[PDB]
Amino acid sequence: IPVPVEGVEYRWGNHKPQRLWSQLTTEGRAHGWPHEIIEYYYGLHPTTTIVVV
Amino acid sequence: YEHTAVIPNQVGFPYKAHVAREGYSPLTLQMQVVETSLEPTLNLEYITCDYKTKVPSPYVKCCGTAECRTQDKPEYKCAVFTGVYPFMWGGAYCFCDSENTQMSEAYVERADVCKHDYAAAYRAHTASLRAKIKVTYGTVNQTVEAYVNGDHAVTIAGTKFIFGPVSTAWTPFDTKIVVYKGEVYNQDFPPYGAGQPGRFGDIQSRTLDSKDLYANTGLKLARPAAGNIHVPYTQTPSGFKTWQKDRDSPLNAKAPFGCTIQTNPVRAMNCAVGNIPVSMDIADSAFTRLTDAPIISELLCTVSTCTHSSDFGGVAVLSYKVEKAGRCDVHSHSNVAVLQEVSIEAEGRSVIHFSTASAAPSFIVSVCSSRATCTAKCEPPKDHVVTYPANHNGITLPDLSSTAMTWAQHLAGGVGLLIALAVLILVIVTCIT
Amino acid sequence: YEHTAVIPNQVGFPYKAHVAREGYSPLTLQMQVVETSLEPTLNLEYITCDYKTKVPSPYVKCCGTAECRTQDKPEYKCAVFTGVYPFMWGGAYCFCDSENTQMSEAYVERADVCKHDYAAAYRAHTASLRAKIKVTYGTVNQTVEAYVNGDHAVTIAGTKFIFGPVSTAWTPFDTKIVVYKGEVYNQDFPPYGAGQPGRFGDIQSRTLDSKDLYANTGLKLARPAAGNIHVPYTQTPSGFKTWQKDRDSPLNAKAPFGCTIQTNPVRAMNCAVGNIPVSMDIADSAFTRLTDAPIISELLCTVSTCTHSSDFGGVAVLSYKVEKAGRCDVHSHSNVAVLQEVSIEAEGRSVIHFSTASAAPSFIVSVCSSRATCTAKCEPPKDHVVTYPANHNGITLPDLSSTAMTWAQHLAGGVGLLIALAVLILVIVTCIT
Numbered sequence: 004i005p006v007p008v009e010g011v012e013y014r015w016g017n018h019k020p021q022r023l024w025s026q027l028t029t030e031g032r033a034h035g036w037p038h039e040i041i042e043y044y045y046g047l048h049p050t051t052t053i054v055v056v
Numbered sequence: 057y058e059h060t061a062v063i064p065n066q067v068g069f070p071y072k073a074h075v076a077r078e079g080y081s082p083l084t085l086q087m088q089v090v091e092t093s094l095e096p097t098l099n100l101e102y103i104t105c106d107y108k109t110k111v112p113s114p115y116v117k118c119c120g121t122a123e124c125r126t127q128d129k130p131e132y133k134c135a136v137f138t139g140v141y142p143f144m145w146g147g148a149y150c151f152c153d154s155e156n157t158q159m160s161e162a163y164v165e166r167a168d169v170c171k172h173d174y175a176a177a178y179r180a181h182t183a184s185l186r187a188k189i190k191v192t193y194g195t196v197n198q199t200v201e202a203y204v205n206g207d208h209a210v211t212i213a214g215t216k217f218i219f220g221p222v223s224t225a226w227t228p229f230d231t232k233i234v235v236y237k238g239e240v241y242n243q244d245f246p247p248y249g250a251g252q253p254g255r256f257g258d259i260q261s262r263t264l265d266s267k268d269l270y271a272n273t274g275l276k277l278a279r280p281a282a283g284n285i286h287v288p289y290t291q292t293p294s295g296f297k298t299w300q301k302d303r304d305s306p307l308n309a310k311a312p313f314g315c316t317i318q319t320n321p322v323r324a325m326n327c328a329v330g331n332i333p334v335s336m337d338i339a340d341s342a343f344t345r346l347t348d349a350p351i352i353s354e355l356l357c358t359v360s361t362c363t364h365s366s367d368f369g370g371v372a373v374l375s376y377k378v379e380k381a382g383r384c385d386v387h388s389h390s391n392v393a394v395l396q397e398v399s400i401e402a403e404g405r406s407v408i409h410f411s412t413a414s415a416a417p418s419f420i421v422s423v424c425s426s427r428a429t430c431t432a433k434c435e436p437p438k439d440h441v442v443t444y445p446a447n448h449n450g451i452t453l454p455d456l457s458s459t460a461m462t463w464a465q466h467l468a469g470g471v472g473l474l475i476a477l478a479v480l481i482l483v484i485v486t487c488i489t
Numbered sequence: 490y491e492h493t494a495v496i497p498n499q500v501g502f503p504y505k506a507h508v509a510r511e512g513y514s515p516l517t518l519q520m521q522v523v524e525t526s527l528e529p530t531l532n533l534e535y536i537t538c539d540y541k542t543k544v545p546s547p548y549v550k551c552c553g554t555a556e557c558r559t560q561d562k563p564e565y566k567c568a569v570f571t572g573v574y575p576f577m578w579g580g581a582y583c584f585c586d587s588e589n590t591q592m593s594e595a596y597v598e599r600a601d602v603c604k605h606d607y608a609a610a611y612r613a614h615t616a617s618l619r620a621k622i623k624v625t626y627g628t629v630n631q632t633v634e635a636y637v638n639g640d641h642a643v644t645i646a647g648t649k650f651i652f653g654p655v656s657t658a659w660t661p662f663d664t665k666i667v668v669y670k671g672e673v674y675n676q677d678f679p680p681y682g683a684g685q686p687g688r689f690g691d692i693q694s695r696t697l698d699s700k701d702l703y704a705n706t707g708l709k710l711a712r713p714a715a716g717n718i719h720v721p722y723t724q725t726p727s728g729f730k731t732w733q734k735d736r737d738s739p740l741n742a743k744a745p746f747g748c749t750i751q752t753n754p755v756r757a758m759n760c761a762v763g764n765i766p767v768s769m770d771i772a773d774s775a776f777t778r779l780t781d782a783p784i785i786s787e788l789l790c791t792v793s794t795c796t797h798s799s800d801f802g803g804v805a806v807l808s809y810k811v812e813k814a815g816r817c818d819v820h821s822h823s824n825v826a827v828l829q830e831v832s833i834e835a836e837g838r839s840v841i842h843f844s845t846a847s848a849a850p851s852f853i854v855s856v857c858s859s860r861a862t863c864t865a866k867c868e869p870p871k872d873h874v875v876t877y878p879a880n881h882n883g884i885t886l887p888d889l890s891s892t893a894m895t896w897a898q899h900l901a902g903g904v905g906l907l908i909a910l911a912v913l914i915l916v917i918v919t920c921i922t
């Protein structure tokens with residue numbers, strides 16, 4: 004099932020329709036003195052506004 | 057006093073309205089939305105149902121002929137036939153072998169169950185939203201029911217509340233939808249007089265009682281074979297039941313924004329779009345005199361841990377001094393964070409639960425006419441998927457916070473000073489002119 | 490046969506549409522509309538009528554007090570006063586000098602006698618026409634009635650007529666309609682909170698059966714006077730019975746395009762708003778095969794007299810030489826005039842009636858695939874005003890045949906000869922150089 008940030012409601016059988024949501028789960032480390040943290044902000048909104056950097 | 061605010065139109069998001077009314081104890085208030093029924097205005101033209109090919113017993117004779125009437129009825133078909141000589145239960149029926157002539161006739165009338173199920177072709181239009189929200193300010197915890205077009209606005213607890221009208225007049229519908237027993241289908245329909253037989257809309261009528269009705273069911277009758285007395289007739293079967301088994305797309309599985317569909321009356325529910333304007337005519341009696349207010353000096357803040365979660369993950373204890381205590385209030389002065397409860401119990405130190413989405417927030421604080429900052433770093437949560445929507449409608453990623461931005465601050469670039477040296481050595485080249 | 494047309498929407502104007510179909514004698518159709526009502530949709534906001542101050546009996550006590558136990562009615566105010574010495578028929582009342590107490594209350598209900606004399610407040614949305622035509626052609630002229638842009642395509646005599654779509658849905662309605670006993674108005678009714686009493690819509694109710702009317706009638710009690718017994722109350726007069734005076738301006742008067750307004754339901758009929766596009770799927774049977782309709786040759790027409798009247802001015806007779814006895818339809822291939830009739834028992838002489846507008850009826854008049862040119866000068870009328878509409882609707886000012894612009898046709902002349910010859914003479918010394 005594709006879960007974007009906007010959530011997904013699935014209905015299976017004769018239950019009541021249930022809902023899932025996706026919080027921010029991308030994983031770099033977000034901080035470091037040798038940083039390599041531009042990967043983190045590629046984790047949110049990827050292939051978008053990395054062209055600005 | 058009068059004030060105006062906005063609110064995001066979903067369920068669950070608690071919204072805070074912190075009016076800065078000087079000369080008084082400050083005030084914040086909470087509104088939470090517990091329904092959004094979006095009904096359009098129906099305008100039907102026809103219905104449908106399976107028909108019944110009702111046929112009377114055939115007129116038989118020999119030894120002479122007859123004719124037919126064609127009275128005012130739906131699709132009166134009839135014809136005589138020359139040479140029909142049958143058998144019977146015993147022996148025969150006539151002895152006029154070259155004159156045995158049989159008439160037959162049949163027509164179309166709505167079935168018995170046409171009083172019980174149909175498909176109304178609704179030409180609905182001009183939707184209008186509703187809401188059932190609850191408001192809590194100081195000595196209030198009561199709910200309210202509100203239309204959201206700019207007109208209807210009355211009261212609660214002796215204060216006047218007005219909601220809307222909407223930001224963007226959007227519908228999750230179409231112009232020409234169809235209904236069924238409990239569902240909604242976004243499709244076309246025949247034009248009430250182009251009822252090509254076999255497809256949808258092969259018979260129709262303006263209502264349940266329009267005593268004349270359209271039909272183009274291709275009905276035609278042929279002549280029987282010898283011996284047995286019966287009547288043959290051919291037409292495409294009742295296309296309504298054919299349309300029953302190939303529906304293949306309801307609205308409750310395809311409508312956008314998860315805004316679910318219900319019927320009787322036809323409405324949509326919990327549309328997650330847009331925002332709502334709101335205006336308040338708030339009475340004085342809710343307020344409290346700043347003489348009797350809690351006086352608080354030397355306010356500070358700090359944090360303990362942050363969780364970059366969906367739930368109220370961040371816990372921030374709060375250092376503040378005291379000189380006289382009471383019932384104080386608290387609010388965030390940006391869009392970045394949100395706060396859990398609307399008040400504290402003023403005793404020495406407090407704990408609050410705040411929620412964010414950007415891992416470096418600088419929501420400052422607001423507490424009883426004393427504003428002071430505190431910033432915190434955060435950390436993503438160990439989990440991936442959850443079972444409740446966000447509580448952090450300010451999903452605003454880039455904060456400055458001087459933590460990752462400070463490298464861009466360390467992109468200063470005094471090579472502009474070098475450019476200035478280039479221009480100056482040009483000048484001292486020019487000074488020997 | 491598929492063929493469309495564009496007719497105007499004016500009551501009584503006889504329109505002609507001519508069809509040149511192959512393998513048959515040409516065909517003429519006529520249509521005119523009568524009851525073109527724009528029945529709009531509708532909605533509801535609230536209702537309004539007068540009121541009645543249900544005052545109960547007054548309550549007293551002898552040196553004992555009371556209070557106002559609440560009663561969930563509309564506008565249930567109450568108070569209690571002291572210092573009373575209430576006389577009666579038998580003079581004095583009791584023995585307690587200055588400790589006696591007065592109890593009273595007031596509450597207003599939607600007065601019963603307004604159940605049948607009320608005022609309604611509506612919002613309103615788009616309208617839809619209902620044309621009702623006579624279709625006036627070679628088969629015994631039948632009458633049709635249709636919604637113009639439901640595209641619901643009624644059929645007659647084997648032919649399927651569709652109508653519309655109508656342009657711009659121009660309506661003589663604002664969006665805040667209010668309706669009284671047999672009239673309508675355009676106002677701004679107060680949005681469910683009567684922020685001013687003594688106005689229209691001072692008291693409201695969701696319907697005739699809603700159990701809770703809302704009143705901001707502004708009713709406070711007063712103090713009883715010295716000596717006698719009574720209940721003093723001072724509240725504003727009835728906003729309804731004082732709104733019925735200042736109406737002064739229906740939509741019945743200021744309606745544009747002459748639309749007569751009716752009630753139950755609200756509807757505006759016989760409007761001269763724009764025009765109507767029509768399409769026809771014409772049955773192939775109702776024609777005539779051209780070996781049977783006579784082919785009259787060797788014809789040239791004439792004229793008698795012309796007029797810029799309105800009813801039917803110009804009469805022009807025609808000469809043609811017959812070969813077989815029959816009938817034939819006629820038509821004029823331009824907009825400069827229309828014809829009183831449709832056909833002719835085409836035996837030799839033929840008298841027809843046309844209607845020109847302004848200056849020069851240049852004509853092409855057709856008789857069974859035969860063309861004939863026609864022009865005529867005119868004599869303008871002498872009257873001033875009439876009591877019936879125009880039948881020459883195709884208002885066309887100019888022309889060019891032997892009287893109009895002929896002075897310009899001689900006026901152009903001149904210049905080019907002079908300049909061209911003058912330069913080609915100029916070269917005779919300026920081409921050798």
Ligand SMILES: *[C@@H]1O[C@H](CO)[C@@H](O[C@@H]2O[C@H](CO)[C@@H](O[C@@H]3O[C@H](CO[C@H]4O[C@H](CO)[C@@H](O)[C@H](O)[C@@H]4O)[C@@H](O)[C@H](O[C@H]4O[C@H](CO)[C@@H](O)[C@H](O)[C@@H]4O)[C@@H]3O)[C@H](O)[C@H]2NC(C)=O)[C@H](O)[C@H]1NC(C)=O
Nearest residue numbers: 531602604605606607609670671696697698752753754755
């Ligand atoms: C002089 O004559 C006129 C014309 O008859 C009277 O006007 C009407 O009074 C009747 C009686 O009340 C009204 O009928 C009622 O209308 C109610 C609501 O209005 C709607 O329905 C009507 C058609 O019935 C529509 O035309 C209109 O646009 C609205 O859609 C209905 O609800 C009433 O039905 C009843 O039965 C149901 C079911 O049991 C109940 O729930 C209802 O409460 C009610 O008992 C009923 O149909 C009629 O609408 C009035 N016409 C108007 C105002 O134009 C005058 O009253 C009469 N003069 C006097 C002095 O009485």
Ligand SMILES: *[C@@H]1O[C@H](CO)[C@@H](O[C@@H]2O[C@H](CO)[C@@H](O[C@@H]3O[C@H](CO)[C@@H](O)[C@H](O)[C@@H]3O)[C@H](O)[C@H]2NC(C)=O)[C@H](O)[C@H]1NC(C)=O
Nearest residue numbers: 519622623624625626627628629630631632829830831832
């Ligand atoms: C078909 O077309 C004809 C035109 O040739 C229509 O005819 C005219 O029809 C009206 C009624 O529809 C006649 O009206 C009235 O007749 C009474 C007498 O019964 C008279 O007293 C009235 O003053 C008025 O004339 C009218 O006489 C008749 N002819 C003319 C010359 O106007 C006809 O109505 C159309 N429809 C049908 C169904 O025939």
Ligand SMILES: *[C@@H]1O[C@H](CO)[C@@H](O[C@@H]2O[C@H](CO)[C@@H](O)[C@H](O)[C@H]2NC(C)=O)[C@H](O)[C@H]1NC(C)=O
Nearest residue numbers: 086088190191192193195196197198199397398
């Ligand atoms: C506002 O007050 C009500 C009760 O006065 C609180 O209660 C709800 O109580 C009803 C009682 O039947 C329960 O069915 C609900 O489930 C309760 N709701 C909740 C959310 O607990 C209500 O909690 C108060 N609102 C607050 C404290 O914000």
